[PDB]
Structures are given as structure tokens and as C-alpha cells.
């Protein structure tokens, strides 16, 4: 538990900047130590920033070029120079507060060389701007209005919404409105989007929302596209599911049966077609250890950024170094990288504290800390949550001190993982004593029961239906949550395998309803 000078001889790293963190939120940072700090925190967002302003408020940043530009107002931008003008129409908010006098004169001024700041100018002199964008079929103007208000809704034709995919807004645009099931008229205009304009991640949601207004045809069609175009071989599985789910070709579910990708699609088809289980890697290292020390976190940022920015040929010198019992987590990581993604790696290190756990419980906890950290005992991340298991210092602590009463327990006691495993068997009984499903304990650990008892209260979600449970796996609000629950319950699934307790993840599906 180090002084802010021992920090600043480290290299800038996510477990750095907690520990700044932790200097800032005990109020030991001083306004003199807080000068030079910015250049030593390595992502300066969230909460360690909200710290540091309240020690030294942000005297930046507009653009040194056009700072005479922002000394205008509504009231005097008739004044400002030309560049001026334009510079200060990029902002929504500033061309709604003008009158509309004003923009009727600037609307003008602009129609040759800017008319996207003409549109929106005349648009905003309309009690709706977002009818008068879509009626000119603007494309930038259409996006820079619904990131300024979600509020707009409305029926798009053909051509608009055959055009929107090629604006770099459209992706998030069409998942949002989508999961949140927000914007009903946007959504139901997109069921005319041609599967021929449309690729990867937005496909698919075009498909599962065809799904939603029970265009089966057009959600294959959009499927088909997504198989077709993902990158990932995860997703393309996600997609030929959906293609089997709904159109029942054998050949899809056997192209599903047949993947080299584990995910809980692959594993579900091969179940179906009495496919054998996958084969699981075997990682035995006689060695019992090395010199690494696998509880300081500063040593796992370092070899963490040597092993993402290595080369085929160093990972085999890596490989070996950290072929040990100890660094087992950190072997398997290599492994991972090495054989780019081919093979299945599912192991269990510090077995000791889970051994005595019924085997289904085992499966749970491996099945988290797999996603959470890959077993890296000193994982710290972007939100701080730390250890194998990752728990974030508010939950850490009510169960080690409230709780526990452990004698002189520090929020550090997380990257031990006879403490990780523990707290996360302890939080595990909770979720799973008030959910049940393995998938939804899965997305309560990583949203919140708060978030998850939310999404369970819904008429729509996890109901019986045609596509359920699979449709409602692909309408978790948060898309974080979505992958998590997926990943995890493949993970479940594997792990239950391996100890001899094996699951038929069918069951599973039919629990969800």
C-alpha cells in the first residue's frame, strides 16, 4: 500500500492508476502532488478524474485557433466572422437556442457551401426538426439530430432507411433502439432494410428485430447475411442458429455441430446431432514454480502488455517460462494467444478452496472467474473491480469487514484467491438463492440483481414463445450483460463437464422459461 512517490516510478498501468485511486479517495493527494498527474494516469475517465478535478478543476479545452469563436452568443452570432458561424452551428443545442429570424439568415448564408447546416437550421425553425431532416432524406443531419434527442420518432420510407447503414452511427443506432425497444416507428420502418446493404452486428439485430414483429422470412434473409459477413466464428454461430431456429435446414445445424468455436450455439447443436462433447486441453506443468510473483499486480501489467505486443516467437520463449503449477493462469494466457484462439483452455487453478463445494457450485465459480479475469489473481479493471473473481471495493468490503469481520481486511484481500473464490462462492449463494438459472445469477454478477430482477418483471422477457429462451438472450438491455450471460453458461457448461457432472445445456434452456 504504496506513497504517491514509489507510483510515479512505475509505468502507467491500470493497477497505477487504483492505487491513485486509492491515495485520492483517502484524501492523501495534496494540490502539489496532484500538479504533474494527469501524465501519470494511463485512462484518465470515470471516477479517478471526478477525484482529481475536485483537487484541480479542468482549466482546458477549446481549440487555442478558434477561441475567439465561443465569446459569441445567441444573441451576437450575426456578428461573428464566417468560420466563426460554421464552427458553432456543429452544436444542435447552440442552432436551438437561436431565433428563428436568425436562422432563416443563416440558413442562407450556408445553402451553397454548408446546406447539411441549412437543413438543420430551417429544420429547427419546424415544430419538428427530425420530419423536415427525414423529408430532405439527410443522412448526417438525421444522426446529429437523434444524438441530440432519442425523442424523435417517426415512419422512414424505403430509400431513407436503405441509405442510413453507410453512416458509422447506424450500428449503435439500430442496437439501441432495438434492445431498449425504443423508437417504434424507426424500428418498424427498418424492416425494409435490404439484407444486400446491411452487415456483421447490424444484421443480426435487423434480424432479431424482424423476429420481434414476426417477419420470419426477413429475419432468415438478415441471419443469413450475418453468417455470411461476421468476422468472429462465435457470431457466425449465433447467426446459424437463428437460420436453423427458424427455416429447420439439417445443413445448418450440422454446419453449427461442426464448429471450431465453443460457445453455448456450437454446444447446443452438437448435443442435438449426438455429437461429441469438445475436446477440453489438458494443461498438467510439472514444474511447481518460477520467480514471478503472482500477488504484486505492477508485475502482471507489465508481462500483460510484453505478452499482447509479442511476436509468434517470443510467446514460445513465454510459453516455457511460465509453464509452472503457480503461474498456471498465466501459462493458459499465453497458450490462448499462442495457438491464436484454436483450442479450448478451461482450467482450474487453486482447486484447493473450491475442492469441498458441491461439483455444480465449482462449475459456477470457475465458470465466473473464466470470464472475469482468466484466473489472473492481481486482475485489476477499468472499473477497479480486483482478483480472480472481481469485485469491485464497495462489495469487497461489506462482505470482508460488515460481514466477515475479518480481522484487518483491505479491499487488496481480493487478489488472494483463497479470498477470491470464498467472496465469490458468498455472492454466488446470494444470486443463486434468488434467481436459480445459472444464466441469470450470470448476468446479476455482472449488472446487478437489481438490473436482472428488472428484466425478469417484464411481460416480454424469458416468457413462453415460438423462439424463447433464445430470443430474450438477445434483448438483454445492456449488451455487456447479453455476451457475459452467453459466455458464462458455455463456460457452466464445460466446467460441469469436466468434474464429472455434466448438464445437458437443453435443460438448462428449458429452466429459462
Known amino acids: ?11 502507467n498501468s491500470l493497477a497505477k492508476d487504483y492505487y491513485i485511486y486509492r491515495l485520492l479517495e483517502k484524501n492523501k493527494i ?29 482549466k482546458p479545452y477549446i481549440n487555442p485557433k478558434y477561441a475567439k469563436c465561443y465569446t459569441y452568443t445567441a444573441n451576437t452570432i450575426l456578428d461573428a466572422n464566417l468560420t466563426c458561424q460554421s464552427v458553432r452551428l456543429n452544436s444542435l443545442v447552440f442552432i436551438a437556442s437561436l431565433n428563428s429570424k436568425d436562422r432563416t439568415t443563416l440558413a442562407q448564408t450556408f445553402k451553397n457551401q454548408r446546406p447539411d447546416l441549412t437543413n438543420l437550421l430551417l429544420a429547427f425553425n419546424t415544430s419538428d426538426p427530425m420530419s423536415y431532416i427525414v423529408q430532405k432524406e439527410d443522412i448526417n443531419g438525421f444522426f446529429k439530430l437523434y444524438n441530440y434527442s432519442k425523442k424523435y420518432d417517426l415512419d422512414l420510407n424505403t430509400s431513407l432507411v436503405n441509405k442510413l447503414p453507410n453512416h458509422i452511427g447506424f450500428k449503435d443506432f439500430a442496437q439501441n433502439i432495438i434492445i431498449k425497444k425504443e423508437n417504434p416507428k424507426f424500428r418498424h420502418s427498418m424492416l425494409e432494410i435490404n439484407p444486400e446493404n446491411v452487415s456483421e452486428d447490424s444484421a443480426f439485430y435487423l434480424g432479431v428485430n424482424a423476429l420481434t414483429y414476426d417477419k420470419t422470412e426477413l429475419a432468415y434473409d438478415f441471419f443469413k447475411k450475418a453468417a455470411q459477413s461476421f468476422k468472429s466464428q462465435s457470431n457466425k454461430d449465433n447467426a446459424i442458429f437463428w437460420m436453423w431456429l427458424i427455416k429447420n435446414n439439417e445443413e445448418d445445424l450440422k454446419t453449427l455441430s461442426q464448429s471450431s468455436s465453443l460457445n453455448i450455439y456450437s454446444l447446443y447443436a452438437k448435443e442435438l446431432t449426438n455429437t461429441p462433447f469438445p475436446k477440453i486441453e489438458s494443461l498438467n506443468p510439472s514444474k511447481k514454480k518460477n520467480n514471478f510473483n503472482m500477488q504484486d499486480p505492477f508485475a502482471w501489467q507489465k508481462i500483460n502488455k510484453q505478452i499482447r505486443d509479442a511476436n509468434a516467437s517470443q510467446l514460445d520463449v513465454l510459453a516455457k517460462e ?49 470470464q472475469e479475469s482468466r484466473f489472473i489473481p492481481t486482475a485489476i479493471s477499468v472499473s477497479y473491480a480486483l482478483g480472480m473473481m472481481q469485485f469491485m471495493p464497495f462489495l469487497a468490503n461489506h ?3 460488515k460481514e466477515l469481520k475479518i480481522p484487518n481486511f483491505d479491499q487488496d484481500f481480493m487478489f488472494k484467491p483463497e479470498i477470491a473464490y470464498y467472496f465469490g462462492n458468498y455472492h454466488l449463494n446470494y444470486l443463486e438463492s434468488r434467481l436459480k438459472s445459472p444464466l441469470f445469477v450470470a448476468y446479476a454478477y455482472n449488472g446487478g440483481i ?39 453458461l458455455a463456460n457452466y457448461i464445460v466446467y460441469r463437464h469436466l468434474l464429472n457432472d455434466s448438464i445437458k445445456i437443453s435443460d438448462i434452456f428449458e429452466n429459462l422459461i
Open 1 to 11: 500500500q504504496y506513497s504517491i512517490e514509489k507510483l510515479k516510478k512505475e509505468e
Open 322 to 370: 511460465f509453464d509452472t503449477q503457480e503461474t498456471l493462469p498465466i501459462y493458459a494466457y499465453i497458450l490462448e494467444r499462442k495457438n491464436n484462439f484454436k483450442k479450448h483452455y478451461f482450467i482450474m487453478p487453486y482447486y484447493d478452496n473450491i475442492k469441498d463445494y458441491n461439483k455444480t457450485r465449482q462449475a459456477l465459480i470457475l465458470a465466473i472467474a473464466r
Open 450 to 488: 437489481g438490473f436482472t430482477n428488472r428484466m425478469l418483471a417484464r411481460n416480454d422477457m424469458f416468457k413462453t414463445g415460438k423462439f424463447e429462451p433464445f430470443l430474450s438472450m438477445e434483448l438483454v438491455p445492456y449488451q455487456e450483460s447479453r455476451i457475459y450471460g452467453k459466455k458464462v
Open 30 to 58: 495534496s494540490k502539489k502532488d496532484a500538479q504533474d498527474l494527469n501524465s501519470h494516469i494511463f485512462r484518465y475517465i470515470g471516477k479517478i478524474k471526478s477525484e482529481l478535478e475536485k483537487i484541480i478543476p479542468l
Open 399 to 401: 462482505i470482508g469487514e
